A and B are shown apart, each in its own frame.
Chain A
């Protein structure tokens, strides 16, 4: 029924870890990572490949997919060849396989346990352009990052180190996904810095600041022009479905004309121009008109040099330039007399 409440129920099933339990899980994870390292030292295979194989057997056959980072394609055939290759190792060596498995299982249990933390953190970041659940899942990504980058030897409670990565993932998400026109994170930090600046000034001056006033309080490199440019960039688009009037019978996009598609006047004028130009090029010979049609690109749609037109007609390039001068000059005299193409000058 309610996705948020349902996820909160799925979270309340997993109990919270005791200090001993939390240390134990983090211990098995870290030892598991070392086990994968050692198994890589022995087998002579990719640590990432080994990790994904161990991860596959732990999670089960319910999940089988290809991993981008890995070089080989990951399929049940491959993971069985490797698992059997791993279980072909002696007692003291095969031990590490059990350590890696136990580690991944502890990792699953650790991430599953601290999901309550993400919820109680992401609840504060609401209203910034991302939904509640979107924030939670992004904090879950950061939680995963925190688990894999955690070191239990420091005696720090996991919540302390997790919170940093969680906030980091959430903030990165809000910076990336919010704006319809995506803006780089550093530029967003700049714009938000401009927001806190303008708000500080408006709070002290009892009015909204000028471009120059903000330019001052921003420091060096900031003038009124650059401030105005930054604000122009931060402008978000507005919905075309924006209601016009107090009824629902009108929309905003209904009042916006199409500037791209040619009006019937445009297409008709273009056709009239092509016809009148052909009527003008027929006042010449077929040769001296062909020189121009090849020169300006009426035919084939390409403008040619004097060397190519001379390589076609069989005369010298100076003869071609001479013919094009005569043709253009004839068209000038034709224009001066007929007064037809003048209206197309636009």
Chain B
């Protein structure tokens, strides 16, 4: 009556079916702000207090269509068999395969007819290097054994006497090698045939080009740069300590494990790419990268424009909860509200304590003037309770017990009958129920436990 709550509502709050709002703190829901004393479900509480998020499992063997940290709209397709149902930032969970592109910068030579090739200070991938009317035969200018290194397209020939390389030649697209790996070549014999036009491969790019004229041909000392991929398989008991597109040198750790063995250690300079996650976590949150020591920590709740990281050069745009990622090196703010919504007689006792009886008396007195019958009736009943508490001097929060009394032992006796057997009252079993559940609660609170 006092809190204007029906039997159903007061039941739901007291027996922890639904929450009740004490101080909304600017929280809103589905377009309308949170009003005080509004009953919200557990799902409404998790969506408000802790923000909304969802994890979508990915079918075996299939890779992801989207990337890490990519902003995702509702209805956007993340996987060939999975479609996201909400707006927010997408995150990888547990990558099955880690592909590392190792950086390689080498020098390699090539000889072509002067009339055929196009003079350029450098060369791009796909860019035509030469145009050959008649098929030309590239000839070995040194003696030794052939080491054939093949790319996705294009090749590398390393001729060597003993274990020392005597020469290194480059074979762009449109050039078919006429030798196998480990073949012995003399001076003059054809290594490859360049038929028609020839261009640079999609993967490798020529940084610098040094040309030298000799006879009717030209020799090109090329400074090349490319990346060679290497796949690493990750086990469920292993975790990746390296973010997307991160830079690592020799010795750096990529994937840790239970034992020192099977650990993935970066062999040389290269970039890291994650593929095939266990699932994808779509979170409604704001991404804030940091390049310096972060002041805020994970677990903290923050209002828009609060000091976050890098001495305060980055701040929050929205209301939410701070989740510090040290892997991707980014401070996340999960879109949520710091809202005070409770359950049980602790929340009820609070609402009863905050009640000013004089104000409600006046409000209901003004309400008693209304022409409607039901209005006057219910207001009379409510005012009867208010007048009762005011005249008596009792406080409404005494209807909720902080300290439950204990009836004297002789009025709930434990006695030994004639046969030496014991007989006791049911109140003792009831009190034991109370003390047990109370003490267990105090222990569960002390050690700390999930809210469930």
A11: contacting residue among B437, B443, B444, B452, CB under 8 A: B452
Residues B297 and A101 in contact, CB atoms below 8 Å apart: yes
Given A24-B239, A91-B293, is A141 in contact with B422 using a C-beta cutoff of 8 Å?
A: no
- Report if A239 contacts B (CB, 8 A): yes
Closest to A23 in B: B237
In the complex with contacts A19-B236, A23-B237, A10-B452 CB distance below 8 A: yes
With a CB–CB cut-off of 8 A, which chain B residues contact A13? 42
Chain A residue numbers with a CB within 8 Å of B414 are 237
Q: Is B328 in contact with chain A by the CB < 8 A criterion? A: no
Contact check, A180 vs B429: say whether CB atoms are below 8 A apart: yes
Number of interface residues of B (CB under 8 A): 49
Which residue on B lies nearest to A236, using beta carbons? B422
Min distance, Cβ B54 to any Cβ of chain A, angstroms: 11
- The stretch that binds A, out of B153-161, B175-183, B298-306, is B298-306
Select the residue from B414, B426, B444, B447 with max chain A CB neighbours within 10 A.
Answer: B447
Residues of A within 8 A of B421 (CB): 235, 237-238
Nearest residue, chain B, Cβ from A235? B421
The residue from B298, B425, B436 contacting A177, defined by CB atoms under 8 A apart = B436
List B contacts of A181 (CB < 8 A): 422
Collect the chain B residues with CB atoms within 8 Å of residue A101's CB. Answer: 297-299, 324
Residues of A within 8 A of B295 (CB): 87
Q: Are B293 and A59 in contact, with the CB atoms below 8 A?
A: no
Contact check: which of A59, A141, A240 meets B423 at CB < 8 Å? Answer: A240
B117 touches A (CB below 8 Å):
no
Contact check, A240 vs B413: say whether CB atoms are below 8 A apart: yes
Query: Which residues of A, 240-258, contact B by the 8 Å Cβ criterion?
Result: 240-241, 252-253, 256
CA A24 – CA B241 in complex, angstroms? 12
> B81 contacts the other chain (Cβ, under 8 Å)?
no
Q: Is B415 an interface residue (CB 8 A)?
A: yes
Which residue of A has the minimal Cβ distance to B278? A20
Cα of A134 to Cα of B17 in the assembled complex, Å:
19
Interface centre among B279, B298, B324, B426 (most CB of A within 10 A): B298
Instruction: Kindly supply a per-residue 1/0 record for chain B positions 413-452, scoring 1 wherever the CB is within 8 Å of any chain A CB and 0 otherwise.
Output: 1110100011111101100100011001001111111101
Interface string of A33-77 (1 = CB under 8 A from B): 000000000000000000010110111101101011100000000
Q: When the two chains form their complex, are residues B293 and A144 in contact, meaning their CB atoms are under 8 A apart?
A: no
How far apart are the CA atoms of A54 and B425 in the complex, in Å?
46
Inter-chain residue pair count (beta carbon < 8 A): 122
CB pair A237 B258 closer than 8 Å: no
**Which of A59, A134, A241 makes the CB contact (< 8 A) with B437?**
A134
Residues of chain B within 8 A (CB-CB) of A235 are 421-422
Beta-carbon contacts under 8 Å, A152-183 to B: 153, 155, 177, 180-181
A65 to B445, CA, bound (A): 8
- Range, interface on chain A: 35 or more
In the complex, which residue of chain A has the Cβ closest to the Cβ of B300? A57
Asked if B93 lies at the interface with its beta carbon under 8 angstroms from chain A, I say yes
Check B326 for interface membership: any CB of A closer than 8 A.
Answer: yes
Interface status of A98 (Cβ within 8 A of chain B): yes
In the complex, the chain B residue whose C-beta lies closest to that of A145 is B447
Most interface-central of A24, A55, A235 (chain B CB within 10 A):
A24
- Rounded to whole angstroms, the CA-CA distance of A102 and B326 in the bound complex is 10
Residue of B nearest to A92 (CB): B293
A-side contacts of B279, CB under 8 Å: 18
Question: Are the C-beta atoms of A18 and B278 separated by less than 8 Å?
Answer: yes
Q: Which of A3, A108, A138 has the most CB of B within 10 A?
A: A108
Given A134-B437, A144-B447, A256-B415, CB of A237 within 8 Å of CB of B301: no
Distance of A134 Cα from B293 Cα, bound (Å)? 47
A59 lies within 8 A of B239 (CB): no
Q: Determine whether the beta carbon of B424 is less than 8 Å from that of A180.
A: yes
Chain B residues contacting A104 (CB-CB under 8 Å) are: 299
A238 touches B422 (CB 8 A): yes
> What 1/0 flags go to A1-30 for Cβ under 8 Å of B?
001001000110110001111011001000
B308 to chain A, nearest CB (A): 12
Tell me if B236 and A23 are in contact (CB < 8 A). Answer: yes
B94 within 8 A of A: yes
For the complex of A and B, the 3 pairs showing the least CB-CB separation, nearest first, are A237-B422, A91-B293, A112-B450
Query: Could you give 20 example pairs across A and B, Cβ below 8 Å?
Result: A13-B42, A27-B239, A55-B448, A57-B300, A62-B340, A65-B446, A90-B293, A94-B293, A98-B297, A99-B326, A140-B444, A180-B428, A237-B421, A237-B424, A240-B413, A240-B426, A241-B425, A252-B423, A253-B423, A256-B415
